[PDB]
């Protein structure tokens, strides 16, 4: 376990997985129980609530890093609005790579859900996106995707170089290249069998980005049709 010091500092910002799982599941089915039998939530509304809680967790993880904390709130906002759906999709993909079997989806609540039971309730776009996500899960598991690479990918997504109109763009540039060097060293060291594993890891970022943009546009158009509940962080995210 030869881990660079930067990767350890980045791992130090990882939230407690079982704690957040219990919090999210309790909040979710309690908000359920706070209605009676036929004023209950849709499955789509359940997933919206799950994504909202996961976005809260993403925000509290992002403000857990000094790199992000030392930026002015405007640049923090710009970063998060550029990268929030990408962080969501990447977190789901990593959860599938770790806890997932096959034939089922593992949720942020800690639930193993039958894959066909979910796929039969989703439309064509959501089914295609979930299929592409499972594809990337399989391709990453064939590469032995671990936690440190996942952390560095999170920090690379949070500090994208495509964000314009920033005050401290140089900070984002420096953090980007620091994480690049650290992750490159780590994976080329602890995984010498697959020379190309670093390029293979970096190649999948545009795919998660495109899936993120498609899902974000679908959710925006759906909430403009009223299918997403309110009093939300996801709403304010789409309302931008």
């Amino acid at each position: 376990a030869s881990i660079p010091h930067l990767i350890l500092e980045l791992l130090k910002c990882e939230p407690d997985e079982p704690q957040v799982q219990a919090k999210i599941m309790a909040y979710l089915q309690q908000e359920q129980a706070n209605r009676s039998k036929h004023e209950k939530l849709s499955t789509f509304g359940l997933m919206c609530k799950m994504a909202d809680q996961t976005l809260f967790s993403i925000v509290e993880w992002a403000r857990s890093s000094i790199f992000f904390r030392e930026l002015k709130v405007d640049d923090q906002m710009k970063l998060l609005q550029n990268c929030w759906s990408e962080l969501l999709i990447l977190d789901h993909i990593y959860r599938q790579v770790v806890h997932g079997k096959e034939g089922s989806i593992f949720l942020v609540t800690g639930q193993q859900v039958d894959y066909s039971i979910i796929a039969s309730q989703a439309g064509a776009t959501l089914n295609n996106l979930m299929s592409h996500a499972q594809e990337l899960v399989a391709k990453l598991r064939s590469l032995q995707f671990d936690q440190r690479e996942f952390v560095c990918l999170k920090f690379l997504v949070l500090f994208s170089l495509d964000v314009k109109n920033l005050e401290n763009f140089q900070l984002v540039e420096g953090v980007q290249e620091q994480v690049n060097a650290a992750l490159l060293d780590y994976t080329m060291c602890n995984y010498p069998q697959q020379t190309e594993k670093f390029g293979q890891l970096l190649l999948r970022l545009p795919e998660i980005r495109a899936i993120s943009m498609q899902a974000e546009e679908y959710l925006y158009y759906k909430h403009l049709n009223g299918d997403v509940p309110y009093n939300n962080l996801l709403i304010e995210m789409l309302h931008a």
Binding site: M77, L80, E236
Partner: peptide, 11 residues
């Protein structure tokens, strides 16, 4: 976005 600003300004 005011809710995100509130969250990030909670310090």
């Amino acid at each position: 976005n005011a809710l995100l600003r509130y969250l990030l300004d909670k310090d």
